[PDB]
């Protein structure tokens, strides 16, 4: 029910390889979801379950992690996946959002 | 040469040896026909049993 | 083809109630559960209230308990959410989302909605 990201702001050039961390109070059983809101868009959902990538679009946003802490280390980052990544458990129902963490450019 | 065991051959026709097409491919092939099995009606149903 | 367009966004005052009609086009609505995710200006997406595939399980946010009304029509291919009383705080724009998560088929939040910019004014 309460979820922290700890990087709020990270500025990593082209290739930088970019972690990003969100541990939850309680067990969440490897069910969280990261998302990366582009400004001016909705989000699109980037991992389920923690480990799995989902429809493929996203290809080097490997995720990892089980029970309390789970990370998104992001690999060659391309200039245009810049944008706020968010994480959320999708199985407890009172579900919750962490603040989030914007890859900006230097 | 080999076959007569001579580095001498004397003039004729003579049987050296075997010619075979070598197989391209591999094919396999199972029946169209589904004959799909109902986990569908147990994996996933409006009610499962207690 | 997949799509979640929304509808309903306009300013509404303080006190007063305007459903919010999440249209559906492409899927089926009936197994898909739907639940809606508001992200007010200059914040984080936050969640509120959801329906099952049956139109029988409403869960609710504790932050807003009872002050929404989430209903699934089949036939329509509408969720239907209205608010009672609106906050002046939740002047976000709200998002319709689709969750097929208990299925052995399915992961959360799979497409997402373009959005309905809701407004509270006064």
């Known amino acids: 029910i309460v979820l922290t990201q700890s990087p709020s702001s990270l500025s990593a050039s082209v290739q930088d390889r970019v972690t990003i961390t969100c541990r939850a109070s309680?067990?969440?059983?490897?069910?969280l979801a990261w998302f990366q809101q582009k400004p001016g868009k909705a989000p699109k959902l980037l991992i389920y379950?923690?480990?799995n990538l989902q429809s493929g679009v996203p290809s080097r946003f490997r995720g990892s992690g089980s029970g309390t802490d789970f990370t998104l280390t992001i690999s060659s980052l391309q200039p245009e996946d810049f944008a706020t990544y968010y994480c959320?458990?999708?199985?407890?129902?009172?579900?919750?959002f962490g603040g989030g963490t914007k890859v900006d450019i230097k | 040469k080999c076959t007569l065991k001579s580095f001498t051959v004397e003039k004729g026709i003579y049987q050296t040896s075997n010619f075979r097409v070598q197989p391209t491919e591999s094919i396999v092939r199972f029946p169209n026909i589904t004959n799909l099995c109902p986990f569908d009606e147990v994996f996933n149903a409006t009610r499962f049993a207690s | 083809q997949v799509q979640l367009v929304e509808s309903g966004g306009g300013v509404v005052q303080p006190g007063r109630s305007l459903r919010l009609s999440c249209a559906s086009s492409?899927?089926?609505?009936?197994?898909?559960?739907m639940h809606w995710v508001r992200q007010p200006p200059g914040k984080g997406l936050e969640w509120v209230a959801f329906?099952?595939?049956?139109?029988?399980?409403?869960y609710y946010s504790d932050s807003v308990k009872g002050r929404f009304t989430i209903s699934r029509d089949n036939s329509k291919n509408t969720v239907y959410l209205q608010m009672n009383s609106l906050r002046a705080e939740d002047t976000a724009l709200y998002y319709c989302?689709?969750?097929?998560?208990?299925?052995?088929?399915?992961?959360?939040?799979?497409?997402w909605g373009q959005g309905t910019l809701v407004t509270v004014s006064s």
């Open positions: 959320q458990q999708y199985n407890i129902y009172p579900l919750t």
């Open positions: 309680q067990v969440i059983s490897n069910y």
């Open positions: 379950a923690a480990s």
């Open positions: 329906i099952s595939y049956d139109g029988s399980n409403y």
């Open positions: 492409g899927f089926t609505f009936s197994t898909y559960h």
């Open positions: 989302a689709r969750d097929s998560s208990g299925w052995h088929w399915g992961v959360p939040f799979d497409y």
